[PDB]
């Protein structure tokens, strides 16, 4: 037997954890003895050319090993044919989007900066492996415990070619535009520095406890206008070109906001690094 | 096992340190155990010129001096002409990065000691028949509070024996505000040309690398900020008239007079690195 081989007939759905246009994550119990004693797992599946993407995502995740990256558990391959499901460890506390609004009383600035350092460690590790994540947002950071977070979704993660600085994306319709660097929005180019920009926005969310009224979308739509439709991205690009950025969160020290601003230099080459962010946060935590 | 051969599979990128002249420098950890405990190294490679990089590698490989950044090795491609230069990593960085953060730590005496070290490293290079062509405070690395090292050799060129200079062809990205008149006017680079650049470097060191008082900003105040493609000719003209960068704040006249000797118009009349060393040492007694 293979413990990474999950048979479809024993993989039983409990409830939804979250879903996109073309993908979804469900809580499942893998219960081969059939007495409701099997382990709970998170299962990512496609909604009935994304199979290739999911298989590549699986091969990425399976080979990533870091305490701040969600753990691969296995796959469920379709008896029928081509289809596949990604099986991951289940973290009950959920993403920062779910967790932070509920745990405001026990999560102070110190712990927010420690989560920020953990995200940076996971991202630095990913970068060293020549991956660009392309979807770094609070909603994709899972809470392991009060003291530990994990990057929990790799659906858009792409490999940077050796001796190149960016990946160019063709399929870009389901893009988190309000987390995206100018080069991504303008030219569909994705550097490691593009993930740093995304980290800055993620840091803003963390600092605002993922409050919906203070979310990146809500704040950018307040700047540009909420009912521009298909012109939203171009107006966003224009607002970024002018130099406008998300404002300092309430109760955020200027030192922290300056580190955030260092993620948001218009030019990718002018932005800070994940290691320089860690150093900056660690200085504030000492 | 060759200790100067660095396997690409164990070189992990951390962050970009800087870039110049078709080259890129990155901090990497050489981490064969896969646990982030490996030694940190500075890795120079091209932005996607290999001949220039290979020549730089061979130069640095054969330089051994306490004030010259240490060559560690190379990372080479398999069945390719690709190559990366591996050097020691100095976490404090260049004077440009370090001095503004450490003014309280680094007084005049220490600045002069750094000046001597720079001169020693440059004089060693000169004795090897090389011209540096890019001596600026950004290219001087801080080993510690007590020690600096010249940290990049991207533009370094050999001067032929029985010749006093190297004639430069590729010059579009030259650091004109550090360049002697002969380099600006005739593209001729002497050892004396490096002495000129050292004087400008000293000015930076004495001003703690403040950008508002940088060589570029100061010269632009003299000649004019918006002369565009005519900047170098206006710079040459100003130099011909005898005008120079002013005395730094709190720099005594005797340090400034040593600096002025670096800036004699004719290269054959300038002070030498050994003469500078003696002059600085006299002040340090
Ligand atoms: N409690 C949970 O939600 C949860 C628990 N363990 C998990 N292991 C892998 C994913 C995952 C979870 N959810 C997913 C995660 C967070 C959020 C909602 C789901 C889809 C998303 O893209 C965005 C990634
Ligand atoms: N902390 C550092 O920056 C650093 C540390 N150790 C190093 N060993 C070799 C280069 C180097 C470093 N940086 C480079 C150096 C200084 C500056 C920025 C880089 C490119 C440059 O041309 C200009 C030479």
XYZ file of C-alpha atoms and ligand atoms in Angstrom:
619
model
C 0.000 0.000 0.000
C 0.881 3.672 -0.511
C -0.193 6.125 2.251
C -0.120 8.976 -0.351
C -2.683 7.085 -2.511
C -6.184 8.171 -1.552
C -8.985 6.040 -3.121
C -12.013 8.070 -4.315
C -14.636 5.694 -2.799
C -13.183 6.265 0.733
C -12.658 10.009 0.426
C -15.860 11.432 1.902
C -16.802 15.118 1.743
C -17.696 16.860 4.994
C -18.012 20.512 3.928
C -16.613 23.310 1.751
C -13.513 25.217 2.888
C -13.336 27.714 -0.046
C -13.708 27.934 -3.835
C -12.654 29.860 -6.940
C -14.126 30.072 -10.439
C -12.385 26.846 -11.518
C -11.176 25.179 -8.246
C -12.326 24.296 -4.724
C -11.035 23.055 -1.377
C -13.280 20.742 0.780
C -12.843 19.141 4.176
C -12.952 15.354 3.678
C -12.574 12.284 5.913
C -10.563 9.495 4.311
C -12.389 6.533 5.748
C -11.315 3.167 4.149
C -12.648 1.099 7.076
C -15.980 2.930 6.696
C -16.814 3.529 10.418
C -16.184 7.292 10.388
C -12.750 6.953 12.071
C -10.419 8.065 9.278
C -8.350 11.238 9.243
C -9.693 14.633 8.198
C -7.896 16.087 5.132
C -8.178 19.170 2.923
C -8.932 18.168 -0.681
C -8.429 20.446 -3.686
C -10.323 19.576 -6.873
C -11.205 21.222 -10.160
C -14.778 22.184 -11.032
C -16.174 19.847 -13.760
C -7.192 22.872 -19.419
C -6.884 23.162 -15.613
C -5.910 19.513 -15.024
C -2.397 20.199 -16.314
C -2.141 23.166 -13.937
C -3.338 21.125 -10.962
C -0.874 18.300 -11.712
C 1.975 20.842 -11.827
C 0.704 22.414 -8.580
C 0.744 18.948 -6.958
C 4.344 18.300 -8.064
C 5.420 21.689 -6.749
C 3.767 21.217 -3.349
C 4.831 17.583 -2.899
C 8.470 18.713 -3.121
C 8.257 21.775 -0.887
C 9.460 21.214 2.698
C 9.179 24.128 5.151
C 7.388 24.680 8.475
C 5.517 27.725 7.009
C 4.329 25.878 3.852
C 1.211 23.668 4.053
C 1.998 19.915 3.942
C 1.217 17.712 0.999
C -0.470 14.434 2.032
C -1.251 12.770 -1.305
C -3.370 12.501 -4.445
C -6.669 10.936 -5.487
C -6.500 9.765 -9.065
C -9.549 9.223 -11.105
C -10.349 5.661 -12.126
C -12.222 7.166 -15.052
C -9.128 8.901 -16.419
C -7.252 12.229 -16.415
C -8.737 13.868 -13.310
C -6.842 14.259 -10.069
C -7.325 15.740 -6.583
C -4.660 17.272 -4.295
C -4.802 16.031 -0.682
C -3.329 18.292 2.012
C -3.184 18.551 5.796
C -6.256 20.111 7.392
C -5.745 23.164 9.611
C -9.041 23.741 11.558
C -8.334 27.387 12.383
C -8.520 28.373 8.694
C -6.980 31.271 6.854
C -6.068 34.659 8.303
C -9.290 35.965 6.647
C -11.376 33.688 8.899
C -9.072 33.696 11.909
C -8.025 37.348 12.463
C -11.490 38.921 12.798
C -12.344 36.255 15.422
C -9.021 36.414 17.369
C -8.389 40.116 17.603
C -8.143 40.019 21.423
C -5.273 37.456 21.498
C -3.243 38.686 18.469
C -1.249 41.881 19.203
C 1.278 43.749 17.015
C 4.089 41.405 18.195
C 2.258 38.299 16.995
C 1.268 40.020 13.720
C 4.964 40.779 13.083
C 5.852 37.163 13.926
C 3.269 35.950 11.353
C 4.761 38.429 8.918
C 8.257 36.926 9.549
C 6.858 33.389 9.031
C 5.223 34.374 5.726
C 8.588 35.913 4.673
C 10.456 32.728 5.628
C 8.097 30.583 3.593
C 8.376 33.014 0.656
C 12.134 33.248 0.862
C 12.288 29.468 0.784
C 9.949 29.397 -2.216
C 12.057 32.031 -3.996
C 15.247 30.007 -3.427
C 13.570 27.195 -5.352
C 12.977 29.641 -8.243
C 9.198 29.803 -7.788
C 6.980 32.852 -8.055
C 3.811 32.315 -5.999
C 1.560 34.880 -7.731
C -1.277 34.672 -5.216
C 0.162 35.867 -1.932
C -2.760 37.177 0.080
C -4.010 36.825 3.670
C -6.770 34.474 2.475
C -4.088 31.959 1.355
C -2.181 31.962 4.695
C -3.448 29.221 7.013
C -3.263 29.342 10.804
C -1.567 26.274 12.294
C -1.904 27.641 15.826
C -1.906 30.974 17.641
C 1.937 31.048 17.150
C 2.297 29.538 13.648
C 1.112 30.264 10.090
C 1.525 28.357 6.795
C 1.271 29.418 3.137
C -1.680 27.253 2.080
C -2.438 27.515 -1.683
C -0.087 27.172 -4.687
C -2.600 27.155 -7.583
C -0.889 29.995 -9.499
C 2.708 29.174 -8.506
C 5.074 29.151 -11.488
C 8.750 28.288 -11.943
C 11.181 31.035 -13.057
C 13.468 29.684 -15.798
C 17.159 29.391 -14.928
C 19.114 32.619 -15.568
C 15.872 34.609 -16.096
C 14.232 37.183 -13.798
C 10.502 36.799 -14.546
C 7.860 34.433 -15.771
C 5.332 35.530 -18.408
C 1.727 34.350 -17.873
C -0.803 33.669 -20.650
C -3.819 32.533 -18.584
C -4.492 35.554 -16.322
C -8.298 36.012 -16.082
C -8.662 34.826 -12.433
C -6.025 37.320 -11.176
C -6.011 38.972 -7.709
C -5.453 42.390 -9.252
C -5.560 44.395 -5.976
C -2.497 42.433 -4.719
C -0.577 42.778 -7.987
C 2.512 44.755 -8.850
C 2.415 47.200 -11.813
C 4.507 44.940 -14.080
C 2.002 42.120 -13.485
C -1.011 44.303 -14.323
C 0.653 46.107 -17.262
C 2.759 43.357 -18.881
C 1.816 40.045 -17.200
C 5.462 39.706 -15.993
C 6.072 38.079 -12.602
C 9.342 38.505 -10.717
C 10.255 37.466 -7.170
C 9.904 41.217 -6.477
C 6.239 40.895 -7.596
C 5.685 38.512 -4.673
C 7.330 41.135 -2.417
C 4.746 43.712 -3.592
C 2.021 41.116 -2.829
C 3.572 40.559 0.581
C 3.238 44.294 1.360
C -0.515 44.097 0.646
C -0.774 40.902 2.713
C 1.007 42.737 5.552
C -1.612 45.505 5.271
C -4.401 42.862 5.652
C -2.725 41.280 8.620
C -2.345 44.671 10.253
C -6.059 45.407 9.611
C -7.068 41.904 10.877
C -8.572 41.125 7.463
C -11.469 43.549 8.044
C -13.582 43.598 4.870
C -14.276 47.333 5.038
C -10.478 47.889 5.188
C -9.598 45.177 2.610
C -7.255 46.005 -0.322
C -10.185 45.786 -2.749
C -12.387 48.116 -0.673
C -9.612 50.681 -0.125
C -8.443 50.725 -3.771
C -12.069 50.879 -5.011
C -12.610 53.900 -2.724
C -9.593 55.609 -4.410
C -10.433 54.791 -8.059
C -14.242 54.263 -7.870
C -16.293 51.069 -7.180
C -18.359 50.896 -10.431
C -15.825 51.114 -13.332
C -16.178 47.427 -14.344
C -13.747 46.249 -17.063
C -11.834 49.592 -16.694
C -10.949 48.830 -13.043
C -7.474 47.439 -13.785
C -6.422 50.345 -16.048
C -7.613 52.911 -13.451
C -5.735 50.934 -10.791
C -2.568 51.013 -12.955
C -2.984 54.774 -13.427
C -3.460 55.309 -9.672
C -0.286 53.273 -8.985
C 1.664 55.191 -11.675
C 0.752 58.446 -9.887
C 2.359 57.089 -6.665
C -0.800 56.436 -4.622
C -0.704 53.440 -2.286
C -2.757 51.833 0.465
C -2.608 54.150 3.529
C -0.963 53.312 6.877
C -3.257 50.951 8.857
C -4.613 52.285 12.183
C -2.163 51.701 15.069
C 0.613 50.642 12.660
C 4.024 52.094 13.612
C 5.629 54.165 10.878
C 8.641 51.737 10.931
C 6.305 48.944 9.879
C 4.581 51.045 7.214
C 7.987 52.057 5.813
C 8.838 48.331 5.355
C 5.467 48.016 3.615
C 6.299 51.013 1.354
C 9.641 49.309 0.485
C 7.600 46.464 -0.987
C 5.673 48.958 -3.146
C 8.370 50.702 -5.180
C 7.012 51.011 -8.716
C 10.133 49.380 -10.207
C 10.658 45.732 -9.210
C 14.452 46.244 -8.848
C 13.903 49.051 -6.254
C 11.796 46.927 -3.913
C 13.141 45.312 -0.749
C 13.663 41.530 -0.255
C 12.066 38.925 2.010
C 15.329 38.560 3.973
C 15.600 42.390 4.431
C 11.949 42.352 5.632
C 12.710 39.618 8.194
C 15.706 41.609 9.450
C 13.501 44.725 9.747
C 10.729 42.866 11.606
C 13.234 41.060 13.897
C 14.715 44.487 14.803
C 11.216 45.652 15.873
C 10.657 42.413 17.867
C 13.924 42.662 19.877
C 36.996 18.128 -4.568
C 37.850 21.665 -5.746
C 36.983 24.170 -2.967
C 36.689 26.973 -5.612
C 34.050 25.004 -7.565
C 30.561 25.933 -6.311
C 27.707 23.689 -7.422
C 24.640 25.597 -8.677
C 22.189 23.133 -6.996
C 23.542 24.268 -3.567
C 23.638 28.035 -4.298
C 20.476 29.580 -2.817
C 19.576 33.162 -3.661
C 18.779 35.469 -0.755
C 18.648 39.032 -2.069
C 20.108 41.365 -4.703
C 23.068 43.444 -3.449
C 23.546 45.700 -6.456
C 24.324 45.776 -10.147
C 26.537 47.540 -12.624
C 27.984 47.195 -16.094
C 26.182 44.126 -17.406
C 26.775 42.394 -14.072
C 24.528 41.633 -11.127
C 25.636 40.859 -7.565
C 23.502 38.709 -5.235
C 23.790 37.374 -1.744
C 23.475 33.609 -1.772
C 23.910 30.926 0.805
C 25.975 27.939 -0.363
C 23.826 25.433 1.454
C 24.695 21.800 0.642
C 23.015 20.518 3.841
C 19.681 22.228 2.922
C 19.091 23.854 6.334
C 20.145 27.475 5.832
C 23.352 27.060 7.849
C 25.633 27.276 4.842
C 28.144 30.036 4.347
C 26.848 33.293 2.847
C 28.605 34.420 -0.366
C 28.422 37.343 -2.808
C 27.716 35.962 -6.300
C 28.278 38.075 -9.420
C 26.605 37.116 -12.692
C 25.400 38.802 -15.856
C 21.875 40.102 -16.362
C 20.545 37.995 -19.316
C 29.599 40.299 -21.886
C 30.639 36.893 -20.607
C 34.133 37.624 -21.900
C 34.245 40.708 -19.643
C 32.996 38.658 -16.676
C 35.547 35.882 -17.313
C 38.366 38.485 -17.496
C 37.181 40.004 -14.219
C 37.187 36.520 -12.574
C 40.803 35.895 -13.661
C 41.889 39.300 -12.374
C 40.303 38.895 -8.960
C 41.387 35.267 -8.619
C 45.046 36.335 -8.646
C 44.749 39.350 -6.272
C 45.674 38.585 -2.634
C 45.559 41.588 -0.292
C 43.880 42.376 3.047
C 42.028 45.373 1.463
C 40.793 43.561 -1.677
C 37.601 41.473 -1.437
C 38.425 37.739 -1.354
C 37.790 35.552 -4.385
C 36.131 32.300 -3.224
C 35.547 30.558 -6.589
C 33.237 30.009 -9.544
C 29.954 28.277 -10.368
C 30.131 27.015 -13.960
C 27.514 25.705 -16.339
C 27.728 22.219 -17.798
C 28.346 22.291 -21.579
C 27.841 26.012 -21.536
C 29.886 29.170 -21.466
C 27.896 30.450 -18.454
C 29.771 31.451 -15.299
C 29.304 33.110 -11.931
C 31.956 34.785 -9.724
C 31.873 33.743 -6.048
C 33.311 36.109 -3.422
C 33.296 36.525 0.339
C 30.224 38.319 1.722
C 30.709 41.387 3.977
C 27.354 41.930 5.777
C 28.062 45.612 6.519
C 28.169 46.379 2.776
C 29.675 49.385 1.019
C 30.673 52.693 2.555
C 27.639 54.077 0.748
C 25.360 51.835 2.836
C 27.413 51.755 6.035
C 28.682 55.301 6.683
C 25.266 57.031 6.994
C 24.182 54.454 9.617
C 27.463 54.574 11.614
C 28.594 58.230 11.876
C 28.778 57.993 15.697
C 31.103 54.969 15.364
C 33.458 56.380 12.670
C 35.374 59.593 13.493
C 38.022 61.433 11.480
C 40.853 59.140 12.590
C 38.954 56.078 11.440
C 38.087 57.751 8.123
C 41.802 58.399 7.543
C 42.575 54.773 8.418
C 40.071 53.655 5.805
C 41.718 56.126 3.378
C 45.106 54.436 3.948
C 43.571 50.987 3.465
C 41.985 52.029 0.201
C 45.334 53.437 -0.911
C 47.152 50.223 0.050
C 44.694 48.076 -1.899
C 44.836 50.402 -4.908
C 48.628 50.494 -4.864
C 48.748 46.682 -4.821
C 46.463 46.674 -7.889
C 48.696 49.256 -9.633
C 51.819 47.129 -8.970
C 49.999 44.313 -10.827
C 49.680 46.677 -13.815
C 45.933 47.158 -13.509
C 43.745 50.227 -13.648
C 40.522 49.998 -11.653
C 38.449 52.656 -13.487
C 35.537 52.553 -10.976
C 36.923 53.650 -7.604
C 34.006 55.140 -5.640
C 32.751 54.701 -2.076
C 29.947 52.419 -3.309
C 32.676 49.946 -4.384
C 34.522 49.995 -1.038
C 33.178 47.295 1.279
C 33.207 47.469 5.068
C 34.809 44.388 6.654
C 34.417 45.921 10.131
C 34.669 49.215 12.063
C 38.478 48.891 11.553
C 38.783 47.526 7.996
C 37.651 48.231 4.427
C 38.189 46.331 1.166
C 37.853 47.331 -2.496
C 34.853 45.201 -3.534
C 34.239 45.185 -7.325
C 36.566 44.926 -10.361
C 33.980 45.130 -13.181
C 35.882 47.785 -15.192
C 39.401 46.720 -14.194
C 41.818 46.537 -17.153
C 45.482 45.719 -17.652
C 47.879 48.478 -18.754
C 50.417 47.123 -21.280
C 54.068 47.299 -20.146
C 55.967 50.140 -21.867
C 52.596 51.962 -21.912
C 51.287 54.323 -19.245
C 47.585 53.864 -19.987
C 44.693 51.777 -21.230
C 42.569 53.218 -24.030
C 38.850 52.571 -23.326
C 36.361 51.669 -26.086
C 33.203 50.766 -24.156
C 32.456 53.881 -22.088
C 28.697 54.678 -22.238
C 28.142 53.809 -18.521
C 31.248 55.556 -17.080
C 31.147 57.248 -13.650
C 31.979 60.665 -15.104
C 31.861 62.551 -11.773
C 34.742 60.371 -10.479
C 36.809 60.607 -13.726
C 39.992 62.554 -14.393
C 40.116 65.034 -17.334
C 42.194 62.665 -19.531
C 39.506 59.970 -19.139
C 36.688 62.412 -20.011
C 38.556 64.099 -22.865
C 40.569 61.246 -24.402
C 39.287 57.951 -22.939
C 42.835 57.273 -21.618
C 43.106 55.696 -18.197
C 46.378 55.898 -16.212
C 47.250 54.769 -12.700
C 47.110 58.517 -11.963
C 43.486 58.415 -13.152
C 42.695 56.064 -10.259
C 44.378 58.575 -7.876
C 41.948 61.253 -9.130
C 39.051 58.900 -8.421
C 40.485 58.149 -4.957
C 40.368 61.869 -4.128
C 36.648 61.879 -5.013
C 36.183 58.684 -2.986
C 37.897 60.386 -0.030
C 35.512 63.316 -0.366
C 32.597 60.819 -0.088
C 34.195 59.132 2.914
C 34.673 62.471 4.724
C 31.029 63.476 3.996
C 29.796 60.061 5.254
C 28.401 59.276 1.778
C 25.562 61.827 2.138
C 23.683 61.919 -1.196
C 22.932 65.683 -1.000
C 26.702 66.328 -0.823
C 27.660 63.575 -3.316
C 30.164 64.192 -6.146
C 27.359 64.117 -8.702
C 25.139 66.582 -6.783
C 28.031 68.932 -5.955
C 29.327 69.091 -9.543
C 25.790 69.543 -10.874
C 25.436 72.547 -8.519
C 28.602 74.041 -10.119
C 27.997 73.343 -13.818
C 24.185 73.163 -13.888
C 21.703 70.277 -13.331
C 19.972 70.278 -16.803
C 22.697 70.397 -19.492
C 21.810 66.851 -20.648
C 24.204 65.424 -23.256
C 26.541 68.433 -22.753
C 27.221 67.627 -19.066
C 30.592 65.947 -19.647
C 31.915 68.788 -21.834
C 30.757 71.345 -19.212
C 32.369 69.229 -16.517
C 35.629 69.160 -18.557
C 35.393 72.918 -19.001
C 34.930 73.523 -15.277
C 37.896 71.274 -14.489
C 40.057 73.101 -17.071
C 39.305 76.352 -15.184
C 40.667 74.758 -11.980
C 37.428 74.419 -10.002
C 37.116 71.345 -7.773
C 34.817 69.779 -5.180
C 34.822 71.904 -2.011
C 36.276 71.012 1.370
C 33.972 68.632 3.281
C 32.323 69.818 6.520
C 34.757 69.433 9.460
C 37.634 68.237 7.241
C 40.911 69.948 8.241
C 42.819 71.834 5.523
C 45.759 69.345 5.604
C 43.450 66.434 4.689
C 41.857 68.654 2.002
C 45.304 69.607 0.589
C 46.084 65.881 0.192
C 42.770 65.536 -1.617
C 43.674 68.467 -3.881
C 46.907 66.678 -4.923
C 44.766 63.876 -6.356
C 43.135 66.500 -8.608
C 46.134 68.024 -10.438
C 44.949 68.500 -14.035
C 47.820 66.635 -15.690
C 48.104 62.949 -14.792
C 51.932 63.113 -14.655
C 51.754 65.758 -11.844
C 49.356 63.986 -9.481
C 50.326 62.447 -6.194
C 50.800 58.714 -5.927
C 49.077 56.235 -3.620
C 52.310 55.682 -1.649
C 52.640 59.456 -1.170
C 49.043 59.675 0.047
C 49.709 56.847 2.558
C 52.704 58.700 3.967
C 50.678 61.925 4.231
C 47.759 60.243 6.020
C 50.124 58.380 8.360
C 51.736 61.710 9.351
C 48.278 62.964 10.473
C 47.555 59.694 12.352
C 50.728 59.983 14.508
N -9.928 25.732 7.250
C -9.582 25.819 5.951
O -10.254 26.564 5.248
C -8.436 25.076 5.362
C -7.750 24.174 6.160
N -6.700 23.489 5.709
C -6.252 23.602 4.435
N -5.268 22.974 3.831
C -5.215 23.390 2.574
C -6.165 24.310 2.346
C -6.891 24.492 3.549
C -8.002 25.261 3.990
N -8.717 26.124 3.164
C -8.311 26.622 1.846
C -7.108 27.587 1.963
C -7.511 28.857 2.705
C -8.614 29.609 1.967
C -9.845 28.677 1.887
C -9.447 27.384 1.155
C -8.994 27.716 -0.257
C -7.778 28.651 -0.202
O -7.368 28.942 -1.532
C -8.191 29.931 0.519
C -6.650 27.949 0.552
N 26.505 43.770 1.392
C 26.964 43.934 0.120
O 26.366 44.731 -0.578
C 28.120 43.195 -0.434
C 28.816 42.340 0.389
N 29.841 41.622 -0.037
C 30.310 41.694 -1.298
N 31.296 41.067 -1.867
C 31.379 41.438 -3.125
C 30.424 42.328 -3.390
C 29.676 42.533 -2.208
C 28.564 43.315 -1.791
N 27.883 44.136 -2.644
C 28.339 44.582 -3.960
C 29.519 45.565 -3.797
C 29.042 46.816 -3.068
C 27.957 47.532 -3.884
C 26.758 46.587 -4.027
C 27.226 45.286 -4.724
C 27.777 45.620 -6.126
C 28.960 46.595 -6.001
O 29.452 46.962 -7.284
C 28.462 47.851 -5.295
C 30.074 45.938 -5.174
